[PDB]
């Protein structure tokens, strides 16, 4: 609990760092008793690393890993996600016994320390292709064995989607079919696109949501926010705007709790 | 190979009847050893019922059940699906010990009689909210107890989505968290919206598809199909056009196997 377990995020730049900052703040807000760790790469500015060190217990510098897999990334319309291979470094954190990896585009709404009851690999179904798990929230065990197997698989075969999710699903191939306890409830990784696709289910189950995931190309930090009125300017067909209170929450935490540390 | 097990579909009109007929035809194509059963309501024309009788071993006349739940159905942009409550009559078929219910907008691509190895209630996850099962394909056990419990729950509480899926998820509430064998692989209910949302996963796993589900407001029978070239006309953002070969297969079956019996 105290020091052998951690939440772990990743940021390769100052843009996703604002996300990592909001995530870590929300984990603090909901009183985690676990360490907070962030993986960062050299593009993150020196000043931003310093700010990350005020929220996170440790900022750990790693090299970018980039799939360069243009084909499969285009197939997803996410040409910019080749560097998500950098996530594989999370397995190197052998200073911890068990960890929860959380995408820097997530936001915690409730304490989720009970995720440490789960065993590797435990993750929520991915909307869209639900026999694959979504790699935005997952419980794992750091291991030089696993780390190096994953790096080898990455270098030899790559990823079916050009990012971390394909390779992680291929490596952890039994998830769909084995042990229901490794299927985390969707309320630990609620994507805005599920709120948009089956709003009736969200109206009935959505109040129990513990983690919201701002999945997709447009990230919370790309919206224009007005803190006087607590409003965002938005464009047609936006899954974030079905239930925009999550996005406004993100911005509220940024504006009041993160912006002062960026002074 | 066993006569007291059946595939079961539903049609409340002559439009979805074309769907049922292609489904039935596809189940014959792939050598099912089970009985074929369609539930029909008084809107289905006399002549169409006779056509159904050439494909289906049993055509069974039941009364429409309609949620009238305009609020929840609108929430989903499916105003027309209140009549999907009629599906609950599938539990009345006590002449059969086990059945697979399949939507009239599914198409079989491979023998799926191994679905009868499963118990009630086995269904594939729903791509939008994957802690709910999709009610387009499901394995169940006809029963007077279950049938009446469902009609009662439908009458007094209704359905969180205005249709069958919501009430069946509420009734079979343990599905997300209990017994992984009851989570059918997505290849037994592959919705075209998953092909569209995560194309990389489809490119790697799609060859294994056993059933395709043309879920959504626009149905294969709503398309303009040219049998000479084997093409359909379509408008932007149509997830059936990501991998249109399935749509075309539906129409090839329809044109060659079914249409001659209608006109
Ligand atoms: O330029 C980047 C891009 C991503 N990230 C990190 O990698 C994560 C994944 O990227 P993200 O933009 O959140 O991807 P998603 O929009 O969430 O989309 C999917 O795309 C990937 C598929 O391989 C997976 O990483 C995700 O979990 C999955 O939800 C981010 O949260 C960050 O932690 C960076 O640090 N820098
Ligand atoms: O006017 C109708 C409408 C539907 N049906 C039958 O009911 C099924 C369900 O309707 P469908 O149009 O296929 O719904 P979907 O587009 O597949 O969308 C969702 O809509 C419902 C939600 O409650 C569930 O029935 C579905 O399985 C679920 O996938 C159809 O296949 C038919 O068997 C009719 O007979 N007549
Ligand atoms: O933004 C690209 C995304 O497309 C999808 O709809 C998938 O469900 C998601 O996991 C993927 O990474
Ligand atoms: Mn993400
Ligand atoms: Mn359907």
Curated annotation (Swiss-Prot), chains A, B:
Binding site for UDP: 10, 12-13, 16, 78, 103-105, 213, 216, 219
Cellular compartments annotated: Cytoplasm; Nucleus
GO biological process, one term: glycogen biosynthetic process
GO cellular component entries: cytoplasm; cytosol; extracellular region; ficolin-1-rich granule lumen; lysosomal lumen; membrane; nucleus; secretory granule lumen
Cofactor, free-text remark: Divalent metal ions. Required for self-glucosylation. Manganese is the most effective.
Listed EC numbers: 2.4.1.186
UniProt enzyme class: transferase
Modification after translation (UniProt): Self-glycosylated by the transfer of glucose residues from UDP-glucose to itself, forming an alpha-1,4-glycan of around 10 residues attached to Tyr-196.
Subunit structure: Part of the GYS1-GYG1 complex, a heterooctamer composed of a tetramer of GYS1 and 2 dimers of GYG1, where each GYS1 protomer binds to one GYG1 subunit (via GYG1 C-terminus); the GYS1 tetramer may dissociate from GYG1 dimers to continue glycogen polymerization on its own. May also form a heterooctamer complex with GYS2 (via GYG1 C-terminus).
Keyword Manganese: yes
Superkingdom as given in the UniProt entry: Eukaryota
Catalyzed reaction equations: L-tyrosyl-[glycogenin] + UDP-alpha-D-glucose = alpha-D-glucosyl-L-tyrosyl-[glycogenin] + UDP + H(+); [1,4-alpha-D-glucosyl](n)-L-tyrosyl-[glycogenin] + UDP-alpha-D-glucose = [1,4-alpha-D-glucosyl](n+1)-L-tyrosyl-[glycogenin] + UDP + H(+)
Carbohydrate attachment residues: 196
Protein name listed in UniProt: Glycogenin-1
């Amino acid at each position: 609990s105290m020091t052998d377990q951690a939440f772990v995020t990743l940021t390769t730049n100052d843009a996703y760092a604002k996300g990592a900052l909001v995530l870590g703040s929300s984990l603090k807000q909901h009183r985690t008793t676990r360490r907070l760790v962030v993986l960062a790469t050299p593009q993150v500015s020196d000043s931003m690393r310093k700010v990350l060190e005020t929220v996170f217990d440790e900022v750990i510098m790693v090299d970018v890993l980039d799939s360069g897999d243009s084909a499969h990334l285009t197939l997803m319309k996410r040409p910019e996600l080749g560097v998500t291979l950098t996530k594989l470094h999370c397995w190197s954190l052998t200073q911890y016994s068990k960890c929860v990896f959380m995408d820097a585009d997530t936001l915690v709404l409730a304490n989720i320390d009970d995720l440490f009851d789960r065993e590797e690999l435990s993750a929520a179904p991915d909307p869209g292709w639900p026999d694959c798990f979504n790699s935005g929230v997952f419980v794992y065990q750091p291991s030089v064995e696993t780390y190096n197997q994953l790096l080898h698989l990455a270098s030899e075969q790559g990823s079916f989607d050009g990012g971390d999710q394909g390779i992680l699903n291929t490596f952890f191939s039994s998830w769909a079919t084995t042990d229901i306890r490794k299927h985390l409830p969707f309320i630990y990784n609620l994507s805005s696109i599920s709120i948009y696709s089956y709003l009736p289910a969200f109206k009935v189950f959505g109040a129990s949501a513990k983690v919201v995931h701002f999945l997709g190309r447009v990230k919370p930090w790309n919206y224009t926010y007005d803190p006087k009125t607590k409003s965002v300017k938005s464009e047609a067909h936006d899954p974030n705007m079905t239930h925009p209170e999550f996005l406004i929450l993100w911005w509220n935490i940024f504006t009041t709790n993160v912006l002062p540390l960026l002074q």
